[PDB]
Design a protein around this ligand. Sequence first.
Ligand SMILES: [Zn+2]
Ligand SMILES: [Zn+2]
Lengths: 645, 645
Amino acid sequence: GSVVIVGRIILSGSGSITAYSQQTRGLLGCIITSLTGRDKNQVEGEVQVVSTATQSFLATCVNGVCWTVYHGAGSKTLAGPKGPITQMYTNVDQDLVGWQAPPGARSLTPCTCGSSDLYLVTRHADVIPVRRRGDSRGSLLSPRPVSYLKGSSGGPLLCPSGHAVGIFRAAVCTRGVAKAVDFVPVESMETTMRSPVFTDNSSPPAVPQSFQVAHLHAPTGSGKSTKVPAAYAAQGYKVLVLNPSVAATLGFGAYMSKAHGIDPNIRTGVRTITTGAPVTYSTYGKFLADGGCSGGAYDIIICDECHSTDSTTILGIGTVLDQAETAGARLVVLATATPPGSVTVPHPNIEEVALSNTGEIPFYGKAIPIEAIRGGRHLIFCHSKKKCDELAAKLSGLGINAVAYYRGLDVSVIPTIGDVVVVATDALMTGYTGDFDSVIDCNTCVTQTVDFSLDPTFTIETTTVPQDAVSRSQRRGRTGRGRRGIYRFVTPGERPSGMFDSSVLCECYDAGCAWYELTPAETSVRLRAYLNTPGLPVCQDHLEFWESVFTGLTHIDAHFLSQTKQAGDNFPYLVAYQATVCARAQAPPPSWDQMWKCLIRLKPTLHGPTPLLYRLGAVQNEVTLTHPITKYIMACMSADLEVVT
Amino acid sequence: GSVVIVGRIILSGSGSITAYSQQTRGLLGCIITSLTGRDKNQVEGEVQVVSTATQSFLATCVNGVCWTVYHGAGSKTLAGPKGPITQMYTNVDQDLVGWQAPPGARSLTPCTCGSSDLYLVTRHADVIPVRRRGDSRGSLLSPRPVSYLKGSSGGPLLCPSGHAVGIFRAAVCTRGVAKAVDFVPVESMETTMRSPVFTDNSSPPAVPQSFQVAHLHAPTGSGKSTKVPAAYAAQGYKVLVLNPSVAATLGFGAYMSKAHGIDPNIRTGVRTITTGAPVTYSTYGKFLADGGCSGGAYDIIICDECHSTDSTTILGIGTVLDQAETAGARLVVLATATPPGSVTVPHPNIEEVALSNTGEIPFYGKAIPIEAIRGGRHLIFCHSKKKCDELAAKLSGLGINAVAYYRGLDVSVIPTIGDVVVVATDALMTGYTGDFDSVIDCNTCVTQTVDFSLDPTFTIETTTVPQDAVSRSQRRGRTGRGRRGIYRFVTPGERPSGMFDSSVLCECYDAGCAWYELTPAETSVRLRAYLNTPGLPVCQDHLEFWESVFTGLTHIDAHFLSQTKQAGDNFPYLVAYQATVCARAQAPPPSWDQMWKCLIRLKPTLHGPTPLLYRLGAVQNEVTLTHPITKYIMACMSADLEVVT
Ligand SMILES: [Zn+2]
Ligand SMILES: [Zn+2]
């Protein structure tokens, strides 16, 4: 699906800067064009109004290039006269993307006066004034609800001479009111246009004379976590390789032994082996538990799957980036086969076949012919545990050897040999190594996002959404390795990779607080190192906010914590902490669902209005906003929060 | 566009009731089938997933008819194999519409067992247990967040035998958590199927022996407001004719005398004339101001333009309905050219032409060629008053003699039939009566909707939305009146007529309190008569909730209330009440918007956070939630509130 031009914002440089919009495409025209990538319409003007079938935003032409934000456009092609125009430039680090301007493009020219008085052209052809306060920041002379600014990202920031100063990126809010705007300065575009680009870093960086962070992008199975570290060790260095799967980490032992005659150290929360070898294999979690970097222990640290966006991986990489040099490493390598900006492409030996409506097994609105999974080894990804159990039972009743697997079940349930259909969630990646004759992908995932609702503080939501490129490549990747494979899907879509939500940041502080004895202040130092490093997944910078919130959650109750940790829930700390507040006031929990079992015992002694701390789910009980901690987090909501538009 | 079937939910034929979905159509296929109304796919099953170009919901075939909610389907045709299928049934009061089922459709049949154990089927093919609690109400064994039920409107409530009990239409929530569901009972549908498809309401009713409420649906210029009251008078009865506009009200009395014989009584805030005639023309507002129905004063009360959902008309009509019988009337005629569920159709006198991108004056993403408006008289409808101030300016600049019109200005329009272009807001209808050579409609308007956002209480948002049919008809009706006319539009669409938001009820309590010295309880009785009476615009029954919040708003500052009433703004009472708590705490208003101008002169003395009661717009100052009124209004948020799904 390409992005398509659906209109434009026409500006005037005569007299004062004024604008007006002119819609040119309809919804049916927008969808057909989006699907074909073939747009015959003639672009005109510098500011284009664009849409993606899901979202709509602005696109502004400057120096031959039509630019817009990565968060809105992803890595999509632009609909063009002769077909889809693939992107000329892509800078996820700058939230910046470009395409070669179409014949009818006028473009803008970069400002050269250095005027701090700016005008932002919004999608409703509104021109609102802004005073530059930074190289990439400006304050609105008149605060406005964010809502007003949404849908205008990608729009220009102009100087009085009507020249381009930058493109609108994000809004800086205070209790939801936009006070300043965030933009990609035109200079970041020059640099971006000059950036060296076919950039091949598919080879093991040479360890430098002085500390350096290097990237290593190589296809899956190119030996980034085995062949590479082995070669490094032959040269005399001590190597630490970090991975997010407990299963994979354990697996490197036998494999390394046989393929490289190296008997590595293995470190996981379930098992560690210290051989004394010069190569160590560890999970980010276990690395975080060991206390992070040990001085003088390693010359090279290879962060495998550095595109992974779970909190443990980000905190873990953040730790490596913050302390690796001071502990004596010369080289930190960030390796992945799918860096930020990746799109899934055809696999030579994997046949991709769309699932139709015929077949005896219903699957997300489509069907699975039983002939495709009777006999053989097949893997079926579902977005939830409920689904996994439902499907595994449907199949079992049909006589097909089916088994479900997800967080909590022992991998023991998956048989390693013989016919089976495995019904699983993404938990499968850390729990199981193994390939399949085929994989069927529902193409959806469950994700969490923070909503700064002010009812009374914030909310962490759980919704099921369209998988992104790395998800689809990891799922499809369980077939096709050294064997011919089949990948069947519900939908062909794929959302842009390389981005993650602020709730993942919140999870880092929770993990730092519940497992790693990390104070909110040390967690920030590490997350900051992560955010300051280019080439890694990106997210809004809400470190201060998140740190301020957890900083106030003092004297949790060990017993509750213990139980929320044992349970293996998503935010053991925040849950355990709400629970403790409830207890120090005989107040019942926000509700009585699974999430609050750690209080269950006392159900009969608990009543009154639960003093709500934040919203972690349905609040069936009445609530009170008077508790001191609740007021504190309430005050934490007045912080400056940058949110995308 | 028609409604198209894009999937279906398949139910089990035995055992416990279970379900699965089948997705039969994708996005582009749906937008195409919607535009052509031609859907050749073959239908299967009873529960269909259906969709418009903006929403998706469910539809259920019971006894050969495919039913769904009016709040989803409006009066839309159903895409079928021979072309669009028109609605066979349209009950805006029960929120039920029905189309004769297309070939391929199977049907559910009424439940004969009378079980109280029910089952609701959702669009995600989930089967939720419900305990029956009334003929149209049920309790969820497990309360769930409202979001879970959304998109399930039109779905069936099934009995253990899988037979139909009702069709789901709304959830009853408590602070956003659904604890029960509302549904149309199957016996109403059966009644609907035993009754007439066509009903005559085209002619003025004869006066009955005893009090009767009747509907009059006749075209504009049918004498609804002139000829029919004249005839009743001409035959001995005392008739009161109520209208929403003072300009239309004054116009009639002036016309009846010089066209039908005698000088009526005229009652408006601006002009009152007692003549002693048996025909009185009043405004709903003056009628309200006078206290309502005076005993034995009229035999007939005609509520003209009863389709009107502004607050003064609803309060006006609910007052007549609650008092006419005891005041001795024998008849109440609810008259309108566009009743609930109506749809804009061709007018023989009006040529309708869709605007394009070619033209000189930019207009809502489109343009208007000055040639269309160079000579003659024309009316352009704009969503805001600012856009009028804009156009009338650019228009004049092009040398065109234009004049912007909206609330606050006096009829400064040139009726002198002297060449002109009046750029107007909807206020036109209440202030001016003339017709024009042509009418240009932006096709959008500005509405208010309430959000039970709990931050800390509720929010009333102002947003611009596509016009509905009443609006189209009325805006278009300002041309072609007994002479050729031209109707130019930016868009073809049309949202369904007959429904209004809960924030309008809030406006009624506001007005009851600010203008008519009505206690909230008294307002409730009148609104209840309105709600209970059929054939009128519908709304969710949030009567008890609204009554309770206004019941707590006591000891308002007489002076602030007085300035807001005069200023003409929308919630005089809520605005003056919020200003009252602020001023007494020596705190600033939520923002320094115009809405809060009655505090502007107190600005030097106002300091601190504002004790926020509710949200009427952007809150830029810090806020405290300690004030007793805020706490009281917060407690009111725990009422059972029914919201559509
Ligand atoms: Zn400049
Ligand atoms: Zn039954």
